[PDB]
């Protein structure tokens, strides 16, 4: 009956509007988190590239001093592998962040403001199109999560390699410092 | 009513699909925050450890230079280099409440005005669904590209570490041969 037909429209409208407002907040939150990740990723890329450049300069400085010692002892040439080829890439997802913020705003226009057969067949078609697109989107999110687990392993491997480097340095250079200490007590300063 | 039923179901079906996409989005964002911050802490550890070793190598070179002659050293300070960390927990949490809270928005139950109202309801739902699907597509695009680069910089970090291991091996090896030559005279 007539009132039930309008009152329903009010429920469909009130519920739908509630979902839009919530979805808008989620879209803004996704845009905010994406922008923050973009920033720290690119900052960290620049920290690494600054590190590599300064290490090259420092290794050359060690290389020069060693040869001077060697030629002094003589009275050879040493090279250390260049690490200049190591480069950290930057990421650019600004276009996606913009679309998210744009649709977040666009949804204001999709809210239902009610006035106080063919359509059904057309409606069957639109949902199918959405179901096909939302499926491809969900598949992309799944494979990305799989890449994120594969990534966790890789970050663990260089956590291992980093600790291995640390102890190799403490062992080699601590031992040199002790051995040199005994040679220095035996020899006279120039 | 038949159209009223059809839209009410289609909505409910799509809300659930959105919910799952929101939950995977918070999940990928949570994983990214962790490996980004781990990779950041590794970089800062490497900087700190290298600075200490460059200082140790610096004193060792000058000490050797003070006992040989006639044929000064401070290495550049890299301790200022810092990798910042990220905090997006508030955004990830909000993504999770909204995905759960979408349960509340689910539904169950002249003649030109109602016909015009249903025409409006269908068109707004269709336009919003199309807009949301496009934004989720953008979210997926950004997450894959984010994974992509953080992986490349993790691999670059790994190759840097293994190159560093050889360079400091070569330095150490040369220093030990210099020590034995000095020991002899």
Numbering used by the authors:
A (entry chain A): 1 to 75, 82 to 122, 135 to 208
B (entry chain B): 6 to 76, 83 to 120, 133 to 208
What does the primary publication say about this deposited structure?
The spike (S) protein mediates SARS-CoV-2 entry by binding its S1 subunit to the host receptor angiotensin-converting enzyme 2 (ACE2), and subsequently promoting viral and cellular membrane fusion by its S2 subunit, leading to the release of viral genome into the cytoplasm. The S2 subunit contains two important domains, heptad repeat 1 (HR1) and heptad repeat 2 (HR2), which are highly conserved among coronaviruses. Subsequently, three HR2 peptides move backward in an antiparallel manner and fold into the three surface grooves of the HR1 trimeric α-helical inner core, thus forming an irreversible six-α-helical bundle (6-HB) structure that maintains close contact between viral and cellular membranes and promotes membrane fusion. We designed a recombinant protein HR121 from SARS-CoV-2, which could highly mimic the conformation of the HR1 trimeric inner core in the fusion intermediate of the S2 subunit.
HR121 monomer consists of HR1–linker 1–HR2–linker 2–HR1 segments (linker 1: GGSGG; linker 2: SGGRGG). X-ray crystal diffraction in 2.41-Å resolution demonstrated that HR121 dimerized into a stable asymmetric 6-HB conformation with a rod-like shape (115 Å length and 25 Å diameter). The HR121 dimer (or HR121) consists of a parallel HR1 tetrameric coiled-coil helix (the four HR1s were termed α1–α4), packed with two antiparallel HR2 helices. The three internal HR1s (α1, α3, and α4) interact with each other via hydrophobic residues located at the “a” and “d” positions. Furthermore, they bind two exterior HR2s and one HR1 (α2) packed at their three hydrophobic surface grooves using residues located at the “e” and “g” positions, commonly found in the 6-helix coiled-coil proteins. As such, the four HR1 helices in HR121 combine to form two sets of trimeric HR1s. The outer HR1 trimer (α2, α3 and α4) also bind two HR2s and one HR1 (α1), but its two surface grooves formed by two adjacent HR1s (between α2 and α3, α2 and α4) remain unoccupied. Notably, these two vacancies may provide two possible binding sites for exogenous HR2s, and are, therefore, expected to create efficient antigenic epitopes to elicit nAbs targeting the HR1 trimeric core in the S2 fusion intermediate.
